[PDB]
C-alpha cells in the first residue's frame, strides 16, 4: 500500500453475545487479507459483503502478533527520527483498549498491548546499540472536544488544557501545561498507565467523561544521540502517538465525536489520495496529531470488530469506514 496501513482485528465472542444467542457472521482470511460479513436478513443466507485490507487479524490472533506485524515497522521509523501515529478504531467493547495497552520481570505479559511492548522495545533497542537517549511520555484524553491531562499529579479537577499554534514551522501545536513524565526503565510504564487509568476514572465519575466516549492519546517522545568512530554523531527525535479512539457507534456530545471521527477519516483519505488541503484544523484530534500525520511518516489504523450477528450494524459501519479511509479493491477468485 503506502505509509498509511489499514488493518482489521476481530475479537472472539464475549459472554453477552453467547447469552443473547448471537451467531458468527464474520470470516477472516489472513492469507487473502479479507474480511467477509454474512449480511443476509431473513431467509437470506447467501449475500455476504467482502472487504480487503493491508492485513486481517482473526479472533485467535495474539497480542505479540499484532505488535510484530503492525508496530515493529513503525517503531523503526520513530527511531530513525520520525513522528508516527497508530490508531485503534471501532465499536465500544471490540478491543480498542485491549489492543492499545492490553492487560513479571523483563519478559512481556502475553496480554500486554501496543503501549507496554513499545516502551519495552525502546529500552531494549536503544540500550543494546549504546545510543544516548531519554524517553518522556504524556497521556491526555479528549472528551466533548476538551483536553484533559491524565498524568498531572496536581492540577487535577475538570480543568481543560489550552491548545494553540506556535511561532515555528506550522503543523505543530503546543498544549499548555501538558505533563510529560520521564521514563527511566521499561517497567516504569505500568505505573504510568495506572495513574492515567485512575485519573480517567475520576473524570468519568466526576464529569461523565467515560473512556468509551473519549479519545485517549498516549505520546512517547525519544531524544537520541548516536556516535561511531569514523561515522560522525547523530541527534534524532522520534515520536509515536498511540491513539485509543472513542466508540465509533447528549445532543452535540455525540456530534463532537461523530464529527471528529469523520474529520479523522477525511484527513486519512486525503493523505492516501494526495488531495491538496487536508482538514487538520477541523477537529481537536486531527490538529493535535497534524505534526505526525502531516510530514512523511508511517501511519496505521487498527479497526476492531465483533464477530456476532448482534453487532452486524456497527461492524459493517466500521468496515465501511476503514474501507473509505484506504480503498483497497478485492482481488479475483472470491
Ligand X SMILES: Nc1ncnc2c1ncn2[C@@H]1O[C@H](COP(=O)(O)OP(=O)(O)O)[C@@H](O)[C@H]1O
Provide the annotated binding site for ATP. 90-97
What does the alpha-carbon distance between residue 31 and residue 133 come to, in Å, rounded to a whole number?
39
**Among the listed residues 8, 11, 150, 291, the single contact to ligand X using CB under 6 A:** 11
**Among the listed residues 33, 96, 215, 266, the single contact to ligand X using CB under 6 A:** 96
When asked if residue 144 is in the footprint of Mg ion (CB under 5 A), the reply is no
When asked if residue 317 is in the footprint of ligand X (CB under 6 A), the reply is no
Nearer to ligand X, 5 or 97 (CB): 97
What does the alpha-carbon distance between residue 216 and residue 311 come to, in Å, rounded to a whole number?
24
What is the nearest approach in angstroms of Mg ion to the Cβ of residue 319?
Answer: 19
When asked if residue 93 is in the footprint of ligand X (CB under 6 A), the reply is yes
Mark 97-116 with x for binding to Mg ion (rule: CB under 5 A) and - for no binding: x-------------------
Nearer to Mg ion, 52 or 144 (CB): 144
When asked if residue 94 is in the footprint of ligand X (CB under 6 A), the reply is yes
**Among the listed residues 134, 185, 212, 327, the single contact to ligand X using CB under 6 A:** 212
Task: Output the CA torsion 233→170→139→190 (10° steps).
Answer: -20
**In residues, how long is the chain?**
334
Beta-bridge mates of residue 48: 38
Neighbours of 327 (CB within 10 A): 11
Nearer to ligand X, 11 or 326 (CB): 11
What does the alpha-carbon distance between residue 24 and residue 17 come to, in Å, rounded to a whole number?
10
What does the alpha-carbon distance between residue 210 and residue 216 come to, in Å, rounded to a whole number?
11
What is residue 133's three-state secondary structure? strand
Q: Site size for ligand X, by CB under 6 A?
A: 12
**Among the listed residues 98, 148, 218, 321, the single contact to ligand X using CB under 6 A:** 98
Part of the chain binding ligand X (CB under 6 A), chosen from 76-84, 86-94, 272-280, 285-293: 86-94
What is the nearest approach in angstroms of ligand X to the Cβ of residue 90?
Answer: 6
Binding-site residues:
90-97
Residue 241 backbone phi and psi in degrees, to 5: -100, 115
When asked if residue 129 is in the footprint of ligand X (CB under 6 A), the reply is no
Alpha helices in 171-252 (DSSP H): 188-205
Residue 42, judged by CB atoms within 10 A of its CB (0-12, 13-18, 19+), counts as exposed
Alpha helices in the chain (DSSP H): 15-19, 63-66, 72-79, 96-100, 114-128, 188-205, 253-273, 284-288, 290-293, 312-325
When asked if residue 218 is in the footprint of ligand X (CB under 6 A), the reply is no
Q: Which residue has the cell 497521556?
A: 139
Part of the chain binding Mg ion (CB under 5 A), chosen from 15-23, 95-103, 197-205, 273-281: 95-103
Please report, as ranges, the residues that interact with ligand X according to CB under 6 A.
Answer: 11-12, 90, 92-98, 212, 304
Amino acid at each position: 500500500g503506502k505509509n498509511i496501513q489499514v488493518v482489521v482485528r476481530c475479537r472472539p465472542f464475549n459472554l453477552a453475545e453467547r447469552k443473547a444467542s448471537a451467531h458468527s457472521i464474520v470470516e477472516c482470511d489472513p492469507v487473502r487479507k479479507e474480511v467477509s460479513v454474512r449480511t443476509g436478513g431473513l431467509a437470506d443466507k447467501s449475500s455476504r459483503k467482502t472487504y480487503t485490507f493491508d492485513m486481517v487479524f482473526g479472533a485467535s490472533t495474539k497480542q505479540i502478533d499484532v505488535y510484530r506485524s503492525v508496530v515493529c515497522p513503525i517503531l523503526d521509523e520513530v527511531i530513525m527520527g520520525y513522528n508516527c501515529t497508530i490508531f485503534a478504531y471501532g465499536q465500544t467493547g471490540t478491543g480498542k483498549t485491549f489492543t492499545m495497552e492490553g492487560e513479571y520481570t523483563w519478559e512481556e505479559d502475553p496480554l500486554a498491548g501496543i503501549i507496554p511492548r513499545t516502551l519495552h522495545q525502546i529500552f531494549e533497542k536503544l540500550t543494546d546499540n549504546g545510543t544516548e537517549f531519554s524517553v518522556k511520555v504524556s497521556l491526555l484524553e479528549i472528551y466533548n472536544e476538551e483536553l484533559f491531562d491524565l498524568l498531572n499529579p496536581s492540577s487535577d479537577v475538570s480543568e481543560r488544557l489550552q491548545m494553540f499554534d506556535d511561532p515555528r514551522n506550522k503543523r505543530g501545536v503546543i498544549i499548555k501545561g501538558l505533563e510529560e513524565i520521564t521514563v527511566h526503565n521499561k517497567d516504569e510504564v505500568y505505573q504510568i498507565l495506572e495513574k492515567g487509568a485512575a485519573k480517567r476514572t475520576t473524570a468519568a465519575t466526576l464529569m461523565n467523561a467515560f473512556s468509551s466516549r473519549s479519545h485517549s492519546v498516549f505520546s512517547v517522545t525519544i531524544h537520541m544521540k548516536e556516535t561511531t568512530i569514523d561515522g560522525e554523531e547523530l541527534v534524532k527525535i522520534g515520536k509515536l502517538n498511540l491513539v485509543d479512539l472513542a466508540g465509533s457507534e447528549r445532543a452535540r456530545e455525540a456530534g463532537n465525536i461523530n464529527q471528529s471521527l469523520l474529520t479523522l477519516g477525511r484527513v486519512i483519505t486525503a493523505l492516501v489520495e494526495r488531495t491538496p488541503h487536508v482538514p487538520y484544523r477541523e477537529s481537536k484530534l486531527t490538529r493535535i496529531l497534524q505534526d505526525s500525520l502531516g510530514g512523511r511518516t508511517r501511519t496505521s489504523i487498527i479497526a476492531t470488530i465483533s464477530p456476532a450477528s448482534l453487532n452486524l450494524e456497527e461492524t459493517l459501519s466500521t468496515l465501511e469506514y476503514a474501507h473509505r479511509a484506504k480503498n483497497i479493491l478485492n482481488k479475483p477468485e472470491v
